[PDB]
Amino acid sequence: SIFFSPLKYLGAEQQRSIDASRSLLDNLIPPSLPQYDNLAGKLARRAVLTSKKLVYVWTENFANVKGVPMARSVPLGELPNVDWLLKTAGVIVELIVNFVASLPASAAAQFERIAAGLSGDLEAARQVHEALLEEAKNDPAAAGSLLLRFTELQTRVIALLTRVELLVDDILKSASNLVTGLNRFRAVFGTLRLPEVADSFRDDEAFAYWRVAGPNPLLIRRVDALPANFPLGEEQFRRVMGADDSLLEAAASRRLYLLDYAELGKLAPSGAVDKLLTGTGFAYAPIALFALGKDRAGLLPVAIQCGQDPATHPMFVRPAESESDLYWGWQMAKTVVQVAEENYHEMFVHLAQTHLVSEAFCLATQRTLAPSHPLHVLLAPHFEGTLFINEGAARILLPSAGFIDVMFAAPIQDTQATAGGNRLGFDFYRGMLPESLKARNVDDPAALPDYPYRDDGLLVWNAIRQWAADYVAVYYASDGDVTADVELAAWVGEVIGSGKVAGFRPITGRSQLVEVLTMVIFTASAQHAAVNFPQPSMMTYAPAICAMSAAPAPDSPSGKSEADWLKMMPPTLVALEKVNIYHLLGSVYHGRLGDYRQTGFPYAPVFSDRRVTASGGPLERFQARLKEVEATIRTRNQARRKPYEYLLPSRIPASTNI
Ligand SMILES: [Fe+2]
């Protein structure tokens, strides 16, 4: 049939190459608000938007993440580019090589040939990419006619990664049988350098410092009157803080800070959770009190209650050096808090509030803002690889016996339900950096001076905020241009109606639009960076932090031992999974905030509007201001106890893609 014949030749590779070239042409259109476009442009963009809703499709019944608004599938165009692919394949092949090299010869035979070939094929692909990038340079006028070999390279790396997958499954099918004090926790690294946290994780001031400069800087809050369920009294406080101090004066001088994990819900099973693959696991919803001394030199831990009900969880107080009989009970209570922390951090702060929020903004943007809408142009780079990585999360990390089931004590269907619930309850406006710092009363550096996430995050937040304002003003001259924009209004409708983004509301003016975009951009870029890139240095070593414990919380502050603490350490399989997935997820830096060039070949500018790209213009100013931020952070880091480098703009990707 004449009507069918084109289908034969029209494969996926051809279609990716077709979309890539279409991409670059549609790139030429000067962007416009729909009300300022001409009749022809209005008709074409309504047609494209209809076609966009074919390809970008909402579901709330995606595998393993029921309830969460997701893409039904990742469009061909949204598959990662060669550059991301090579990078990520590179890390996983390194980790495979490291692992096989750590096995006895007998057992290595399973994998050693497959691994050698994966490593050699990656090397052949990298060399291809290099030579392709050399011919473009030698003849840049012919550059556009090399894109097809870049798409061909893309097909080759995808196939590499499918083979990489088959090996990882075979290794991890066998790991429980392959795995062999804290000796086992160092052995899992193989040749990987152990993080610095492995040498100081027992230090009490280091433990407090997690609250302000660790992977979860969001939960800590000021407390003015302690709640009934945390019955710490003045004698206990004064025992830690000195007789010249008191709860009452500490409260009043804004020196008390509470860490309360009540919101974990089923992520903190009420008791033992026995699993075949990992044995008996526990996790917790503790409450910990921290305080500043009068000089506010630094936060100190004061007391830890290992669950919500004091009638069933005793109060653990910071011991003195001399108090050997309290030493181990206290190390157990800290471990409890860190078990809560991995759960809170990874499920809520990382997965629910970055990844899964950006999912919804991605889908709404592609479905309702035309490709030539200025806000599409602005936002699209900040979603690159987001749909792909999150489908990765759902499929690969969240099923039975997957990484999350292995690494987090809860039953996997409780984990999935609690993660998704936190996403659905997450309020877009309350979740804004300035709003979070106000609501928790941690916004004033004279009360809480050392808080690197706050002070470094405000630099980045405010830099993005000026950029958004500068950019909106190019296109929207008044509030009426905002309310007359039918695309922006449809986007709002979908963010609420399909995206289920709590707290989202009509946008009725420019200042509010700026705040909205600032949130969307910051969430995709800096917030993600801040909570994802700690994983390799802070969360790869299981005795410092793990989302499951093999023993219950300590039953008494007194009389515990080293043996009793060691009981809490997880099985070896958990530690093996931990080091590998956390190295991986924090080792791919793809794209950079403010660059706004394509991150794949031909690496073209994002913005063609000469008003945006003008010398001294909005984009240049944002790029200049990020470099000023870098320099200020680097200066701050000279005076800090440890550098906090996650919010250096040079380390912040534009998008959430790992
Ligand atoms: Fe991430």
**Measured in angstroms, how far is the CA atom of residue 213 from the centroid of ligand 1?**
17
Contacts of 171 (CB under 8 A, 6+ apart): 96, 99, 111, 178
Alpha carbon dihedral 219, 225, 226, 229, in 10-degree steps, equals -110
Alpha carbon distance 242, 232 (integer Å) = 15
Cis peptide before 602 (omega within 30 of 0): yes
Angle at 480 between CA 478 and CA 481, to 5 degrees: 70
Question: Ligand 1 center to residue 56 CA distance, Å?
Answer: 22
Count CB atoms within 10 A of the CB of residue 255. 21
- Compute, in angstroms, the gap from residue 350 CA to the centroid of ligand 1: 6
Q: Is 415 exposed, middle or buried (0-12, 13-18, 19+ CB in 10 A)?
A: buried
- 350 labeled binding residue: yes
Chain position carrying tokens 């200025």: 374
The stretches of 440-546 forming alpha helices (DSSP H) are 452-475, 479-483, 486-497, 510-522, 528-532, 535-538
Dihedral over alpha carbons 156, 159, 164, 166 (to 10 degrees): -160
Question: Residue 555 has which token pair?
Answer: 């039953």
Chain Cα centroid distance, residue 500: 20
Ligand 1 midpoint to CA 310 (Å):
36
Cross-strand partners of 55: none
Picking from 589, 608, 573, 604, the residue whose alpha carbon sits closest to that of residue 649 is 589
**With contact defined as beta carbons under 8 Å apart, do 503 and 427 qualify?**
yes
Q: Which of 73, 171, 153, 63 shows the shortest CA–CA distance to 115? A: 171
Breaks in the chain after residues, C-to-N cutoff 2.5 Å? 180
Q: How far is CA 233 from CA 273, 314, 588, 596, in A?
A: 34, 13, 47, 55
E strand or H helix that includes residue 289? strand 287-292
Q: Is the dihedral of CA 630, 632, 633, 637 positive or negative?
A: positive
Q: Are 332 and 557 in contact (CB under 8 A)?
A: no
> What is the DSSP track for 406-451?
HHBSS-HHHHHHHHHHHHHH--TTTTSHHHHHHHTT---TTTS---
Say how far apart CA 318 and CA 336 lie, in whole Å.
Answer: 14
Which residues in 268-294 are b (16+ Cβ under 10 Å) and which e?
A: bbeeebebeebebbbbbbbbbbbbbee
Long-range contacts of 124-131, Cβ-Cβ distance < 8 Å, separation of 24 or more: 125/86, 125/89, 125/153, 125/156, 125/157, 125/160, 126/86, 126/90, 128/153, 128/156, 129/82, 129/86, 129/153
Distance 656 CA to ligand 1 centre (A): 6
Residue 528 marked in a binding site: yes
Query: Which residues share a beta bridge with 259?
Result: 288
Residue 71: phi, psi to the nearest 5? Answer: -75, 130
**3-state SS assignment for residue 15:** helix
Find, among 349, 348, 386, 454, the residue nearest to 591 by Cα: 386
CA–CA distances in Å: residue 472 to residues 26, 293, 311, 435, 512: 21, 45, 55, 22, 11
Q: Give the bridge partners for 304, in sequence order.
A: 288, 316
Distance from the alpha carbon of residue 393 to the mean position of ligand 1, in angstroms: 9
Considering only CA atoms, give the Rg of the chain: 26
Residue 509 CB coordination number (10 Å) = 14
Does an H or E element contain 238, and which? helix 234-241
3-state secondary structure of 50: helix
Distance of alpha carbon 124 from the chain centroid: 31
Structure tokens at 471: 């950019």
Q: How far is the CA of 533 from the centre of ligand 1 (A)?
A: 8
| Ligand 1 mean position, distance from CA 459 (Å) | 21
Q: What is the DSSP letter of 282?
A: B
Amino acid at 257: Y
Experimental approach was X-ray
Helix (H, G, I), strand (E, B) or coil at 316: strand
Closest CA to 422 of 357, 329, 490: 357
The Cα 498–Cα 357 span in angstroms is 12
| Cα of 32 vs its chain's centroid, Å | 33
490 to each of 297, 498, 514, 621, how far by Cα in Å?
51, 11, 17, 31
Provide long-range contacts, Cβ within 8 A and 24+ apart, for 72-77. 73/391, 74/387, 74/388, 74/391, 75/387, 76/12, 76/15, 76/16, 76/19, 77/16, 77/19, 77/20, 77/23
Residue 477 CB coordination number (10 Å): 12
CA of 441 to the centre of ligand 1 (A): 27
13 C-alpha vs ligand 1 centroid, how far in Å? 28
Q: Fill in the amino acid letter for 446.
A: A
**Residue from 189, 122, 533, 207 nearest 350 by CA:** 533
Phi and psi dihedrals of 432, rounded to 5? -70, 135
Span from the CA of 531 to the centroid of ligand 1 (angstroms): 8
Distance, in Å, from the CA atom of 146 to the CA atom of 303, rounded to the nearest integer, reads 63
Q: Is the dihedral angle over the CA atoms 117, 118, 120, 121 positive or is it negative?
A: positive
In angstroms, the CA 193 to CA 186 distance is: 9
SS3 291: strand
Gap between the Cα atoms of 547 and 399, Å rounded: 17
What is the spatial distance between Cα 519 and Cα 302, in angstroms, rounded to a whole number?
Answer: 35
Distance between CA atoms of residues 394 and 68, nearest Å: 10
Under DSSP, the state recorded for 256 is E
Using DSSP bridges, classify how beta strands 256-260 and 221-222 pair: parallel, antiparallel or unpaired: antiparallel
Bridge partners (DSSP) listed for residue 289: 258, 303
Expressed in angstroms and rounded, the spacing between residue 226 Cα and the centre of ligand 1 is 34
Cα–Cα distance between 365 and 375 in angstroms, integer?
8
CB 433 within 8 A of CB 522: yes
Does the annotation list 583 as a binding residue?
no
Distance, CA 32 to ligand 1 centroid (Å)? 33
Contacts of 115-120 with C-beta under 8 Å, sequence gap 24+, read 115/167, 118/93, 118/160, 118/163, 118/164, 118/167, 119/93
Rounded distance, CA 461 to CA 366, Å? Answer: 24
Domain ranges of the chain: 11-613+649-658
Q: Among all chains, which residue has been given the structure tokens 């995606």?
A: 62
Measured in angstroms, how far is the CA atom of residue 205 from the centroid of ligand 1? 27
| Distance from Cα 104 to the centre of ligand 1, integer Å | 33
CA distance 352 to 358: 9
Strand 273-275 to strand 256-260: parallel, antiparallel, or no bridges (unpaired)? unpaired
Q: Residue 54 corresponds to which tokens in the numbers above?
A: 């074919």
Evaluate whether 188 touches 572 at the Cβ level (below 8 Å). Answer: yes
Q: How far apart are CA 573 and CA 548, in angstroms?
A: 12
Show the DSSP H helices in 253-402 as ranges: 324-343, 356-368, 374-379, 386-392
* Axis-axis angle for helices 324-343, 204-213 (nearest 10): 20
Task: Tell me the H-state helices in 80-193.
Answer: 82-101, 105-108, 112-138, 147-178, 183-187
Between CA 646 and CA 348, with CA 87 as vertex, the angle to 5 degrees is 45
Chain centroid to CA 186:
25
- Please, what is the Cα angle at 461 between 456 and 467, to 5 degrees? 130
What type of residue sits at position 570? P
